[PDB]
């Protein structure tokens, strides 16, 4: 995947998940630039789960699968973003173990990715 294809993919992924929830555009805009520094609604957390289920990086219980995510990366991000992503997978692989509810598990993992990101982080 090229950078151009990646950027466009963000919108396509969103379109498959956003209609399932009641979401604020301002909240989506913030996640899009990797700003997870605000309290999320349950809907927003579950939206992150929907996006991650589409990526194949989590199961329906919201458990993050590090090996599968590593294997999926070439199908999710451009070469330019692989190392940052590999590094975040590793730093955030166990975040889900601190939470029991599936949407929260995924949201907190995504938040970790955004904080651990050593470059710009973008969420669909």
From Swiss-Prot:
Tissue note: Specifically expressed in chemosensory system in both males and females. Expressed in a subset of trichoid chemosensory sensilla located on the ventral-lateral surface of the third antennal segment. Secreted from non-neuronal support cells into the sensillum lymph that bathes the olfactory neurons within these sensilla.
A GO term, aspect molecular function: odorant binding
Chain sites annotated for binding 1-propanol: 52, 57
Main localisation: secreted
Location within or outside the cell: Secreted
Keyword Disulfide bond: yes
Disulfide bonds: 17-50, 46-103, 92-112
Keywords for the protein's UniProt record, in alphabetical order: Behavior, Disulfide bond, Olfaction, Pheromone response, Pheromone-binding, Secreted, Sensory transduction, Signal, Transport
Binding site for ethanol: 52, 57
Positions of butan-1-ol binding: 52, 57
GO biological process annotation, one example: courtship behavior
Family in the record: Belongs to the PBP/GOBP family.
Role played: Odorant-binding protein required for olfactory behavior and for activity of pheromone-sensitive neurons. Binds to alcohols and mediates avoidance behavior to high concentrations of alcohols, the alcohol-binding possibly resulting in activation of receptors on T2B neurons, the activation of these receptors inhibiting these neurons. Acts in concert with Snmp and lush to capture cVA molecules on the surface of Or67d expressing olfactory dendrites and facilitate their transfer to the odorant-receptor Orco complex. Required for cVA response, probably by binding to VA.
Protein name per UniProt: General odorant-binding protein lush
Source species of the chain: Drosophila melanogaster
Lineage of producing organism: Eukaryota, Metazoa, Ecdysozoa, Arthropoda, Hexapoda
């Amino acid at each position: 995947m090229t950078m151009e294809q990646f950027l466009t993919s963000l919108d396509m992924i969103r379109s498959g998940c956003a209609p399932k929830f009641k979401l604020k555009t301002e909240d989506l805009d913030r996640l899009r630039v990797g700003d997870f520094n605000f309290p999320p609604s349950q809907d927003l957390m579950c939206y992150t789960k929907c996006v991650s289920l589409m990526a194949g990086t989590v199961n329906k219980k919201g458990e993050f699968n590090a090996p599968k995510a590593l294997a999926q990366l070439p199908h999710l991000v451009p070469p330019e973003m692989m190392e940052m992503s590999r590094k975040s997978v590793e730093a955030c692989r166990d975040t889900h173990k601190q939470f029991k509810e599936s949407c929260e598990r995924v949201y907190q993992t995504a938040k970790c990715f955004s904080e651990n990101a050593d470059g710009q982080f973008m969420w669909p």
